[PDB]
Amino acid sequence: SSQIRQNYSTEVEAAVNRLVNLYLRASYTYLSLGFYFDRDDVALEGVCHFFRFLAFFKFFGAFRLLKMQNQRGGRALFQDLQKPSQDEWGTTLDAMKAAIVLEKSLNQALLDLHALGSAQADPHLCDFLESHFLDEEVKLIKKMGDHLTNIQRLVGSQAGLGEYLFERLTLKHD
Amino acid sequence: SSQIRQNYSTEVEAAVNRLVNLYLRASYTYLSLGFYFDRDDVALEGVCHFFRFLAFFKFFGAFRLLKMQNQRGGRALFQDLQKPSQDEWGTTLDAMKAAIVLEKSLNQALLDLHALGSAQADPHLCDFLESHFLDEEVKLIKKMGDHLTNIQRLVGSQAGLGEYLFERLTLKHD
Amino acid sequence: SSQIRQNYSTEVEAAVNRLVNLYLRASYTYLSLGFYFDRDDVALEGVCHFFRFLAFFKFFGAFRLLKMQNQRGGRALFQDLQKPSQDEWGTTLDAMKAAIVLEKSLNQALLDLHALGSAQADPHLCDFLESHFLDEEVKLIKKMGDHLTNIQRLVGSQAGLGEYLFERLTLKHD
Amino acid sequence: SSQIRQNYSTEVEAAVNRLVNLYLRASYTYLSLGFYFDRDDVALEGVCHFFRFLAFFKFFGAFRLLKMQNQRGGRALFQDLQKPSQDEWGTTLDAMKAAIVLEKSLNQALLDLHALGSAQADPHLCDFLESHFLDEEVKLIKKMGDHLTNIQRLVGSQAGLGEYLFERLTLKHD
Amino acid sequence: SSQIRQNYSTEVEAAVNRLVNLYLRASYTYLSLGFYFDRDDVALEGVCHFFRFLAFFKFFGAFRLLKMQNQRGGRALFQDLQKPSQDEWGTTLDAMKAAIVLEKSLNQALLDLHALGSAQADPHLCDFLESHFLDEEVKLIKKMGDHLTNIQRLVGSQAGLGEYLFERLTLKHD
Amino acid sequence: SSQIRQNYSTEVEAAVNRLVNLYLRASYTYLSLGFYFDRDDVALEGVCHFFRFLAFFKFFGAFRLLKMQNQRGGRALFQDLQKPSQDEWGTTLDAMKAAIVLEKSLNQALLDLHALGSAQADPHLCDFLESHFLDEEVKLIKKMGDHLTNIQRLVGSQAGLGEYLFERLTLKHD
Ligand SMILES: [Cl-]
Ligand SMILES: [Cl-]
Ligand SMILES: [Cl-]
Ligand SMILES: [Cl-]
Ligand SMILES: [Cl-]
Ligand SMILES: [Cl-]
């Protein structure tokens, strides 16, 4: 058995491995979103950069979980990674709606793992999620919600104009 | 005969001279585009500067070809340079469409010369085009395509508004 | 159809998408290798850092391919990503042998794509692979081969001693 | 009609467009002169650099005229550009004689345009030529004349020696 | 067999070893040229330094080939090195003519190896020659041709005078 | 005859030319040793760098002799250079033993030339060897002897371990 493992349930160990798969799935979804908005026939650089950054950020979340798994003496186990849900992502509005759906799913997975940890009396797990994941997720979802509202107010009856303006004047670009 | 020339066909030498004429023609087209957008009755500074820069960039391509001609021991031969295809260039959209047509023609000329070089077993010629021309051309055409998509999304039903916004918020100006 | 695409076959476009999948598979394999050597019951930091860096490097290769796909006017298409071939990776020797097998497979995929590009008279594709992939791969495989030889000479009859010494004195660590 | 144009005759507008053609012709002549002296079988670097600089300087003159055309509310119109008068330019002496002939022709065109402007009571045109063209031209022709005299004194009965010495000791080179 | 070797023919491996011998032969020829022009009864320092630098440059070419041989998993094999073709090298003109003959022979060997690589579908080999050898060779041969033309124009009927002047005013010396 | 030569025998002149051949032979031997230890199946970087440096150092010795030949008014004469004695160099121990054999042969050649110079009452020759060659050779042979002793003490019954340790902990590497 493990020489370091202490107060670390098999249930938590397995749930952490599943959460890693979810975050890597999310990372891959954002990679696809980024390259869609980089297409010459889409060409919204600020949108591309927004999702490319999220791809890296979700990968970092997976990395932290994996590090924690080893710190606790669990065994990182990797599974197949499903492709993203779409090949083409429509408008900025469509994409930001898909992103907030994705983030809510990751948030619920975080809350579910926190509840498991609490049931298992695993305070290191609970604190780890609180300190590195829960607030970052709330902050990101608030940001997406802010963006959705601004995108929606810009649709009006000149959708193209508003999509350009949002990309130019809210999102970070060269 | 030439004291330095080696593995340099007459076919390649002649094709290089024709390519120089094509690039100088392109340079002159961009000079005309630039001065059109500088007119007081057109007055799109970012568009003017975009095409003025391309005039210089295409001249630089011609210059590099001429330098290479001499490095290989061929003889630079200059022909008459035809004037651009238009005197007035319409909207930014019209102009960017003409530019991408022009660039595709230069790209095809590059690919044709590369194929001639390959047929003639002239690896210095092939590498020269690969290293200094092919990727620069792909990059430029991608940029133009990005611009066309952004211009097209801004037309809407307020063409003037969108043409101003594109010039202000995408193209580089004072 | 595409407004920028020129001299870019459907065969190459599809092969690039498959190559992206191969590089992301390789990246994921290296992520798993890295976290195995980070285990408290394996604990070879220099080996962990070697494979973690390769995970990032292979991801970067996939990223460059995807960027190129868009520059040429092809469509990035993502498929499911299979999990790595093993859950536990044995000794440093075992792992470095698996790594060189993996790299040879990526190298053969590169050479196959280069041959397709050459058959299709696609010099931009050929140059792209030459300039950004082929030499990096040769260099990496040479490095792995150097490492294998040093690992093999250290096995002797005190395998543990040699595995520690290699990690301490050849691989980069804190 | 034009919203800015004032005191700008059609005669001057047309003459400015013709002068642009003359300066671009001169620029192209100097480009050809430069590349001739860059040939491996000519190989006079200081002579190459002298004419390359003049190619740029004459292009700059054309550019200033075009800018002025727009500032006055005239319409820049570009015509075909004839190739230079020669494909091969003989000795430095031959080339410098051709250059001074060329410059005298540009100078006479300047003086003719100034006279037209004066007849048309167009003081902005007259001042523009005085301030940016007439003295630069006098200065250049004086310099060429200085060079011709030095070249002629070096011919003697060892033409090759003198042509080398002039290039080395008067003209600017690496 | 080799643990790293992939897509590297025996034909290419052998041809690389022969090319190393050719470059080391060339290096030795330049060493001899340099020391001839350092003789008190020849005493042309700029000529000495020109050929001494080429001795080092050709050695560097051999070194790069040898490094590449190992990177590909071939076996560097060294053969006897023949002495240079002459013990005394005549005038600067004689020497520069011998040098351009030598360089054309190295260039043809490069082109022959590139053709072998292409026949063998060895793109790493082809790119290696393109990126590190072909253009450097074209550049050097152009430089030599420039020098030959300047030497030839200085012969006149005062050969000694012209040989001194060329060494003083074109070649780099203290 | 020579305008500078004084007190410089034909015997010394010829012996200097032979010594140059010996040092260039030694340089080539070290080049081969270096590239052997750079092989992926040998892979001892510190050993590679040790012999690569000696290749350069022996070349420098040959260069100094050639310079001296000219300073004295003798004629540098180059002969064919035989290939090294081996294609593969065995262990570090084997290689260092071959190196000390080589160095002892160069040292004896130095001492023989010094004795010839002394017999010929050629104090400039004697001082030249004393000041630039004899002590450098003694120092190098002492260093090699130190290395041999350390290599021999590390063989024990785990030859691979000791060869790695010597390369890592005594020889200079990245
Ligand atoms: Cl799926
Ligand atoms: Cl026309
Ligand atoms: Cl699988
Ligand atoms: Cl004409
Ligand atoms: Cl021989
Ligand atoms: Cl032998």
mmCIF file of C-alpha atoms in Angstrom, chain C residues 79-172:
data_model
loop_
_atom_site.group_PDB
_atom_site.id
_atom_site.type_symbol
_atom_site.label_atom_id
_atom_site.label_comp_id
_atom_site.label_asym_id
_atom_site.label_seq_id
_atom_site.Cartn_x
_atom_site.Cartn_y
_atom_site.Cartn_z
ATOM 1 C CA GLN C 79 -11.420 13.801 -32.846
ATOM 2 C CA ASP C 80 -11.509 11.807 -29.654
ATOM 3 C CA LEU C 81 -8.118 11.439 -27.972
ATOM 4 C CA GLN C 82 -7.186 7.987 -26.864
ATOM 5 C CA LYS C 83 -5.595 7.499 -23.470
ATOM 6 C CA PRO C 84 -1.941 6.527 -23.226
ATOM 7 C CA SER C 85 -0.844 2.956 -23.813
ATOM 8 C CA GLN C 86 0.084 2.305 -20.159
ATOM 9 C CA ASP C 87 -1.052 3.427 -16.690
ATOM 10 C CA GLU C 88 2.325 2.642 -15.058
ATOM 11 C CA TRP C 89 5.600 3.102 -16.946
ATOM 12 C CA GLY C 90 8.158 0.891 -15.141
ATOM 13 C CA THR C 91 11.751 2.065 -14.899
ATOM 14 C CA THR C 92 13.393 5.123 -16.438
ATOM 15 C CA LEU C 93 14.772 2.689 -19.050
ATOM 16 C CA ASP C 94 11.281 1.370 -19.826
ATOM 17 C CA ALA C 95 9.945 4.884 -20.093
ATOM 18 C CA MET C 96 12.740 6.186 -22.308
ATOM 19 C CA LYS C 97 12.312 3.144 -24.611
ATOM 20 C CA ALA C 98 8.568 3.889 -24.851
ATOM 21 C CA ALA C 99 9.358 7.535 -25.583
ATOM 22 C CA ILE C 100 11.731 6.754 -28.449
ATOM 23 C CA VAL C 101 9.107 4.333 -29.927
ATOM 24 C CA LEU C 102 6.570 7.179 -29.702
ATOM 25 C CA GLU C 103 8.917 9.703 -31.289
ATOM 26 C CA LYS C 104 9.789 7.354 -34.183
ATOM 27 C CA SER C 105 6.047 7.014 -34.836
ATOM 28 C CA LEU C 106 5.609 10.822 -34.923
ATOM 29 C CA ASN C 107 8.689 11.095 -37.180
ATOM 30 C CA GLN C 108 7.286 8.550 -39.608
ATOM 31 C CA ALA C 109 3.973 10.477 -39.657
ATOM 32 C CA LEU C 110 5.919 13.669 -40.444
ATOM 33 C CA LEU C 111 7.815 11.946 -43.269
ATOM 34 C CA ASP C 112 4.580 10.487 -44.638
ATOM 35 C CA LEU C 113 2.913 13.912 -44.654
ATOM 36 C CA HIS C 114 5.989 15.432 -46.300
ATOM 37 C CA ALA C 115 5.786 12.770 -49.019
ATOM 38 C CA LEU C 116 2.087 13.527 -49.557
ATOM 39 C CA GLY C 117 2.850 17.193 -49.825
ATOM 40 C CA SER C 118 5.603 16.535 -52.322
ATOM 41 C CA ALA C 119 3.273 14.308 -54.409
ATOM 42 C CA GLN C 120 0.638 17.074 -54.303
ATOM 43 C CA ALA C 121 3.242 19.753 -55.284
ATOM 44 C CA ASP C 122 2.539 21.645 -52.048
ATOM 45 C CA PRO C 123 5.853 23.386 -51.276
ATOM 46 C CA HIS C 124 4.495 25.537 -48.475
ATOM 47 C CA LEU C 125 3.507 22.313 -46.612
ATOM 48 C CA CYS C 126 6.884 20.704 -47.303
ATOM 49 C CA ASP C 127 8.818 23.764 -46.140
ATOM 50 C CA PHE C 128 6.604 24.094 -43.044
ATOM 51 C CA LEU C 129 7.493 20.566 -41.962
ATOM 52 C CA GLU C 130 11.175 20.982 -42.793
ATOM 53 C CA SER C 131 11.485 24.319 -40.979
ATOM 54 C CA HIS C 132 9.493 23.558 -37.818
ATOM 55 C CA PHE C 133 9.283 19.746 -37.341
ATOM 56 C CA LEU C 134 11.824 17.493 -39.063
ATOM 57 C CA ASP C 135 15.025 18.766 -37.462
ATOM 58 C CA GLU C 136 13.385 19.178 -34.043
ATOM 59 C CA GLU C 137 12.369 15.541 -34.222
ATOM 60 C CA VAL C 138 15.814 14.323 -35.332
ATOM 61 C CA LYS C 139 17.387 16.320 -32.485
ATOM 62 C CA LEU C 140 14.986 14.892 -29.908
ATOM 63 C CA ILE C 141 15.445 11.285 -31.037
ATOM 64 C CA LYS C 142 19.258 11.746 -30.883
ATOM 65 C CA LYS C 143 18.926 13.061 -27.337
ATOM 66 C CA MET C 144 16.763 10.126 -26.320
ATOM 67 C CA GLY C 145 19.229 7.716 -27.880
ATOM 68 C CA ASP C 146 22.055 9.384 -25.888
ATOM 69 C CA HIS C 147 19.994 8.991 -22.739
ATOM 70 C CA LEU C 148 19.183 5.297 -23.447
ATOM 71 C CA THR C 149 22.865 4.515 -23.866
ATOM 72 C CA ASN C 150 23.701 6.230 -20.549
ATOM 73 C CA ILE C 151 20.849 4.515 -18.748
ATOM 74 C CA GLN C 152 21.900 1.101 -20.148
ATOM 75 C CA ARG C 153 25.542 1.582 -19.110
ATOM 76 C CA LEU C 154 24.355 2.376 -15.543
ATOM 77 C CA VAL C 155 22.261 -0.724 -15.016
ATOM 78 C CA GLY C 156 25.206 -2.995 -14.239
ATOM 79 C CA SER C 157 24.133 -5.137 -11.260
ATOM 80 C CA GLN C 158 22.917 -2.198 -9.108
ATOM 81 C CA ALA C 159 19.898 -0.997 -11.050
ATOM 82 C CA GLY C 160 18.569 1.301 -8.314
ATOM 83 C CA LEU C 161 21.943 3.059 -7.893
ATOM 84 C CA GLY C 162 22.243 3.664 -11.619
ATOM 85 C CA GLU C 163 18.689 4.941 -11.969
ATOM 86 C CA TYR C 164 19.282 7.444 -9.173
ATOM 87 C CA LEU C 165 22.625 8.557 -10.570
ATOM 88 C CA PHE C 166 21.227 9.129 -14.048
ATOM 89 C CA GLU C 167 18.380 11.213 -12.668
ATOM 90 C CA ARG C 168 20.727 13.242 -10.469
ATOM 91 C CA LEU C 169 23.682 13.762 -12.810
ATOM 92 C CA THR C 170 22.182 13.894 -16.322
ATOM 93 C CA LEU C 171 18.577 15.080 -16.000
ATOM 94 C CA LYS C 172 17.726 18.669 -15.011
#
